[PDB]
Write a protein that binds this ligand. Structure first.
Ligand SMILES: *[C@@H]1O[C@H](CO)[C@@H](O)[C@H](O[C@@H]2OC[C@@H](O)[C@H](O)[C@H]2O)[C@H]1O
Ligand SMILES: *[C@@H]1O[C@H](CO)[C@@H](O)[C@H](O)[C@H]1O
Ligand SMILES: *[C@@H]1O[C@@H](C)[C@@H](O)[C@@H](O)[C@@H]1O
Ligand SMILES: *[C@@H]1O[C@@H](C)[C@@H](O)[C@@H](O)[C@@H]1O
Ligand SMILES: *[C@@H]1O[C@@H](C)[C@@H](O)[C@@H](O)[C@@H]1O
Ligand SMILES: *[C@@H]1O[C@@H](C)[C@@H](O)[C@@H](O)[C@@H]1O
Ligand SMILES: [Ca+2]
Ligand SMILES: [Ca+2]
Ligand SMILES: [Ca+2]
Ligand SMILES: [Ca+2]
Length: 195
């Protein structure tokens, strides 16, 4: 009878009946002739805007980065415990599988944990001594100089060391006084013919 026409598709098995037939489907198929591939994606199993891809008796999810895992329930977050130290900025890679760190001044290494020794190419000026520190440095100035890199010749004329209105000229750790009429001495402290 009716199974002679080989009606079942998708590998189903036909059984003859009174005035018809039944197809027993392989797992994953349904319909009178097993023509339907059951849509296991109908339950919307993929999270986080992943795409469900139907299979025979199953599905998978293609996740949208940075989500991953069987149902897009995991997230790639290489910057989550901020591996960049000492103020460094964490940047996630394009594919979210790795990170990089932009280090602050003074720091280097993959995670910004290695000091830079500024004294190797010392920025200190005017004979100052360079002291390297962890994440910085310090210049120790010679007499007469100030500033971060001991680059400033100190203004020895402020406050004015010249008494009695004398004019001050700055030098290296020194000041020179030109006295007003009536005054003399290194700092104009001596009066002559006054009152
Ligand atoms: C509908 O969504 C369910 C999760 O909320 C998911 O489990 C169903 O998938 C079944 O799980 C096992 C797998 O082998 C079967 O094919 C599938 O039907 C999903 O269809
Ligand atoms: C022969 O097969 C067809 C389907 O292709 C079915 O309609 C008939 O009943 C069967 O005998
Ligand atoms: C008949 O039943 C179906 C479900 C498949 O297992 C076939 O291979 C078999 O012949
Ligand atoms: C299915 O694939 C995932 C990765 C996302 O791109 C969705 O937009 C798409 O439908
Ligand atoms: C390095 O050390 C500092 C403190 C100054 O004394 C410099 O003259 C010296 O070379
Ligand atoms: C400095 O020189 C003294 C002697 C005065 O003439 C001042 O006014 C000047 O600034
Ligand atoms: Ca029959
Ligand atoms: Ca299916
Ligand atoms: Ca340093
Ligand atoms: Ca000076």
């Amino acid at each position: 009878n009716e199974c002679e026409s080989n009606p079942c598709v998708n590998g189903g098995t036909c059984k003859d009946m009174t005035s018809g037939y039944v197809c027993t489907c392989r797992e994953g198929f349904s319909g009178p002739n097993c023509q339907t591939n059951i849509n296991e994606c109908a339950s919307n199993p993929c999270l986080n805007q992943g795409t469900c891809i139907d299979d025979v008796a199953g599905y998978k999810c293609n996740c949208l980065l940075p989500y991953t895992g069987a149902t897009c329930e995991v997230v790639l977050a290489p910057c989550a415990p901020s591996p960049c130290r000492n103020g460094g900025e964490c940047r996630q890679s394009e594919d979210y599988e790795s990170f990089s760190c932009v280090c602050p001044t003074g720091w280097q290494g993959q995670t910004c944990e290695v000091d830079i020794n500024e004294c190797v190419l010392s920025p200190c000026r005017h004979g100052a001594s360079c002291q390297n520190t962890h994440g910085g440095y310090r210049c120790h100035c010679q007499a007469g100089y100030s500033g971060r890199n001991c680059e400033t010749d100190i203004d020895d004329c402020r406050p004015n060391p010249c008494h009695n209105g004398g004019s001050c000229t700055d030098g290296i750790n020194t000041a020179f006084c030109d006295c007003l009429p009536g005054f003399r001495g290194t700092f104009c402290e001596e009066g002559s013919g006054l009152e």
